[PDB]
Symmetry: C2
Subunit: 222 residues, 2 copies
């Protein structure tokens, strides 16, 4: 089952963006739909030959072949579909499209990892909870120039010149320079607070509202 | 009793600012202390002869007379105190100082009423809960050009041309134009949401004891 392999992408709250690779051009549209344009090379120009159009909730996939299946010149936006389409639920998408769905799925997931959900200004730092929940990335931009980038798999640290190093196990973190273990105590507190605030706002989001409660920016730089 | 005329001012979260009249200068300092410099003019130059230094919570008043009471030329910041001071709790400030305290008190009150606590972007409007709690001003900037400004004694409405009118009682509110009642029901929802969000966030702020949770910016303009 595809739902075993990955979860449906969710592009809610994500800003429009276009990524051009060798394999595809993946776009998050203004409607939060995600499109995968499979581009073919007929030198010099590239043609859009196939399009996967994925719904913002990730559960509807519309596949079509623009220009009668002959192709469209790759443009700034994807070609809109015609009544000639094939369409599937996520749970019903044939495997032949799984790899292409995941192009979108992954891109969305990457964009979420760079999309601020909650920004929290503290005395020493600017905290940013990202959108790739759960286990979202957590960035910490201290004003002195120190940068801490939290992940699920690791914790990055960038010192004031560019001394970059990646910390993994807690046993490796304890072994860090002792003026730094305090920076983490800040960064971890922000993280706890941001997570704390995310929870409370989501709860309030569930009840009657009129617009999303995310993103949120809390406070200001001094 | 002074507690009858005002509440101790509150300058938390308020941005630095300086206002000059002929008789005095009020500043909200970067520390959120509020100063009243009483100014007198001696041959073209103006001197600070008296200073009231009020705590950010409005409950401590330190009063002094710079340069021996002869004065210091009015500068960009108030003259700092010396060993020679008198200092009072709010409830203990002598009447001789009440009108000068009220000078700081009124100014702080004007600033809060113009200082955003919660900014909330909707599909149709930009809502801003001000800081003059309780009964804070709540202004609503619809994108189409309609403006609604909720206030303590009344509700102003500005239509797309400049049709300004004041509603003070339900009798004028029910009697409102029927399509305007639509703008108002939004505005009223925004207020409830913003008030709801204010309460839930302050509560979590109390437990955390770290950088403030206000102001916030919720969402984005479409
Ligand atoms: Cl291009
Ligand atoms: Cl349709
Ligand atoms: Cl098919
Ligand atoms: Cl959510
Ligand atoms: Cl929503
Ligand atoms: Cl002292």
């Amino acid at each position: 089952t595809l739902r075993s392999i990955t979860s449906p992408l969710v592009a809610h709250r994500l800003k429009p963006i276009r990524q051009k690779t060798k394999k595809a051009v993946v776009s998050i549209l203004d409607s939060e739909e995600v499109c995968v344009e499979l581009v073919k090379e007929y030198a010099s120009q590239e043609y859009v030959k196939e399009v996967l159009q994925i719904s913002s909730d990730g559960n509807t996939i519309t596949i079509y072949y623009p220009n009668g299946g002959r192709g469209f010149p790759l443009a700034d936006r994807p070609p809109s579909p015609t009544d000639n389409i094939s369409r599937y639920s996520f749970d019903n998408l044939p495997e032949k499209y799984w790899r292409k769905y995941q192009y979108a799925s992954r891109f969305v997931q990457l964009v979420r990892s760079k999309s601020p959900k909650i920004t929290y200004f503290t005395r020493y730092a600017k905290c940013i909870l990202m959108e790739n929940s759960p286990g979202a990335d957590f960035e910490v931009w201290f004003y002195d120039g120190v940068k801490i980038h939290k992940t699920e798999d690791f914790i990055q640290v960038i010192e004031k010149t560019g001394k970059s190093y990646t910390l993994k196990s807690e046993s490796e973190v304890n072994s860090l320079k002792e003026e730094i273990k305090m920076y983490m105590d800040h960064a971890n507190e922000g993280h706890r607070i941001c997570l704390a605030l995310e929870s409370i706002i989501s709860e309030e989001e569930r009840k009657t509202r009129s617009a999303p409660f995310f993103p949120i920016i809390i406070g200001r730089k001094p």
